[PDB]
Design an enzyme around this catalytic site. Structure first.
Site, PDB file in Angstrom:
ATOM      1  CB  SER A   1      89.250  32.448  64.985  1.00  0.00           C
ATOM      2  OG  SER A   1      88.413  33.527  65.460  1.00  0.00           O
TER       3      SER A   1
ATOM      4  CG  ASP B   1      84.703  35.508  63.054  1.00  0.00           C
ATOM      5  OD1 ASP B   1      83.744  34.776  63.423  1.00  0.00           O
ATOM      6  OD2 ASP B   1      85.784  35.601  63.700  1.00  0.00           O
TER       7      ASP B   1
ATOM      8  CG  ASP C   1      85.660  30.851  64.667  1.00  0.00           C
ATOM      9  OD1 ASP C   1      85.744  32.017  64.263  1.00  0.00           O
ATOM     10  OD2 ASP C   1      85.996  30.518  65.828  1.00  0.00           O
TER      11      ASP C   1
ATOM     12  CG  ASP D   1      84.631  33.456  67.662  1.00  0.00           C
ATOM     13  OD1 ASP D   1      84.725  34.201  66.685  1.00  0.00           O
ATOM     14  OD2 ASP D   1      85.616  33.148  68.327  1.00  0.00           O
TER      15      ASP D   1
HETATM   16 MG   LIG Z   1      86.266  33.960  65.116  1.00  0.00          MG
END
Ligand SMILES: [Mg+2]
Ligand SMILES: O=C[C@H](O)[C@@H](O)[C@H](O)[C@H](O)COP(=O)(O)O
Length: 467
Positions: free
Chosen positions: A101, A238, A240, A242
């Site tokens: 992440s 960002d 990934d 989310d």
């Molecule tokens: Mg993230």
């Protein structure tokens, strides 16, 4: 050794995760589910990944463990964490996302999902316990499950079908691509929505983006691109995907909690759930705000207790839609995990509907001037020691300038110091990496910048002195 749960996910050094640990943690997870009667022999477990260098290897190890345990790995390739979870939850199957992440580029991780959502803190403990009890295991990669784009396509359709084809015609939007798993998705989805998108700053190198601590470089890039009179906004996510990363028509960053507020308004939210680090001006607009500790599992646990929709979000900008939303005869189903596409599109749709620039929309909330940043490479023991120091009334007074008295201290999540002036300085150890967070609020941009710098210097000095 570096590998542990924290705020959300199992995370640590890529060189440690890429090997037996990824295989064994995955085994612990699936066996945990099977033990609980929730996973039966041959059931599907969906795997997705981000664009970190170690991610293909780690996904292959995860898929190996899934298959060795007697279940069926499904390779969803490279896609947003919320896309994987949306699809797997719709299929009533667990999933594993391979991503660090926001964390540095020498790290990676695993984000675990049950069939009905993110794993909770009880699940985290049961996984760790099962991992501890595994034998001294034959780690094995699975390269053999052909990539399916089903999850990415279903996720795209979620938004296209909700807003409708051509529904944002007239907008021109930059897409800051870097190494976002949504870099290409955003181009085609925006095009389907009638937006003219423009690709910007694609990177063949993984770029760790932390939306609560943007690099000065990314801030300068957003300004430079967004200074063109040709773009209504710049959008990104960002690594990934989310979390959204949104800039206005002048290339100025819209902090994630403000994108969250704009999103709550757009979906007609009744109750908002957000951590303590979200802008304190939120309650001025929204009469029902439930405040939580920082982290998705805390936000989800509060959302679950609430009976328009329930919406969760964090200052990182990720939005957790708790209730099905309806609009012009179309539905957007609940997805109780952080999403970037919803806040992006809510912001763009607001601009489109009101025929008003995003900077004006953002300003209409009158948020307190907030800044956030972090110190990197701070071991857990050092941040724990610093935070303990701040619990001592004498030490606090020693560390901060005398003229602005501390009138209240909270230790709900880290240590937040409230000042007679109205300034506030909040420190937290990141649970996801060895980093110390410093968040501030003040009365104008000058005072906020000075306050952020002071907060970071106080921590730096105290951390060096305790060493
Ligand atoms: Mg993230
Ligand atoms: O960070 C990822 C978390 O799991 C997320 O849910 C959290 O709200 C923040 O993005 C930061 O948490 P830390 O400050 O603990 O890294």
């Amino acid at each position: 050794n570096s590998l542990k749960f924290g705020t959300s996910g199992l995370r640590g050094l890529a060189v440690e995760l890429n090997g037996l640990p990824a295989y064994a943690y995955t085994m612990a997870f699936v066996q945990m589910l099977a033990a609980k009667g929730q996973l039966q022999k041959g059931d599907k477990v969906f795997v997705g990944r981000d664009l970190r260098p170690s991610s293909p290897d780690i996904a292959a190890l995860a898929m190996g463990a899934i298959e060795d345990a007697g279940f069926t790995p499904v390779n969803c390739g490279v896609l947003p964490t919320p896309a994987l979870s949306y699809y797997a939850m719709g299929a009533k199957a667990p999933s594993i996302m391979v991503t660090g992440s926001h964390i540095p580029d020498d790290r990676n991780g695993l984000k675990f999902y049950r069939r009905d959502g993110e794993i909770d803190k009880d699940d985290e403990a049961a996984i760790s316990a099962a991992y501890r009890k595994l034998p001294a295991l034959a780690a094995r990669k699975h390269v053999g499950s052909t990539e399916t784009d089903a999850a990415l396509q279903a996720y795209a359709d979620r938004y296209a079908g909700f807003l409708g084809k051509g529904s944002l015609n007239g907008l021109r939007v930059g897409v800051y691509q870097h190494s976002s798993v949504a870099r290409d998705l955003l181009m085609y989805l925006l095009t389907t929505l009638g937006v003219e998108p423009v690709a910007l700053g694609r990177s063949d190198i993984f770029v760790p983006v932390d939306t609560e601590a943007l690099r000065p470089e990314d801030i300068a890039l957003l300004a430079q691109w967004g200074k063109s009179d040709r773009l209504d906004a710049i959008v990104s996510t960002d690594g990934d995907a989310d979390r959204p990363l949104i800039a206005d028509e002048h290339g100025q960053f819209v902090r994630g909690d403000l994108a969250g507020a704009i999103t709550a308004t757009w979906v007609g939210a009744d109750t908002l759930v957000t951590p303590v680090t979200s802008n304190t001006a939120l309650e001025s607009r929204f009469p029902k705000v439930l405040r939580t500790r920082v982290g998705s599992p805390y936000v989800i646990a509060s959302m679950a207790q609430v009976s328009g929709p329930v919406i969760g979000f964090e200052a990182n900008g990720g939005v957790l839609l708790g209730s099905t939303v309806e609009r012009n005869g179309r539905s957007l189903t609940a997805l109780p995990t952080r999403d970037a596409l919803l806040p992006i599109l809510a912001c763009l749709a607001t601009v489109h509907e009101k025929k008003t620039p995003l900077s004006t929309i953002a300003r209409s909330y009158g948020f307190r001037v907030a800044l956030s940043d972090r110190l990197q490479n701070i071991p857990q023991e050092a941040s724990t020691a610093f935070l303990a120091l701040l619990e001592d009334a004498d030490k606090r007074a020693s560390l901060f300038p005398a003229g602005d008295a501390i009138v209240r201290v909270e230790t709900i999540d880290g240590v937040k110091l409230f000042f007679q002036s109205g300034n506030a300085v909040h420190y937290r150890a990141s649970g996801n990496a060895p980093e110390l967070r410093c968040y501030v609020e003040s009365s104008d941009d000058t005072q906020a910048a000075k306050l952020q710098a002071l907060g970071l210097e106080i921590a730096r000095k105290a951390l060096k002195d305790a060493t």
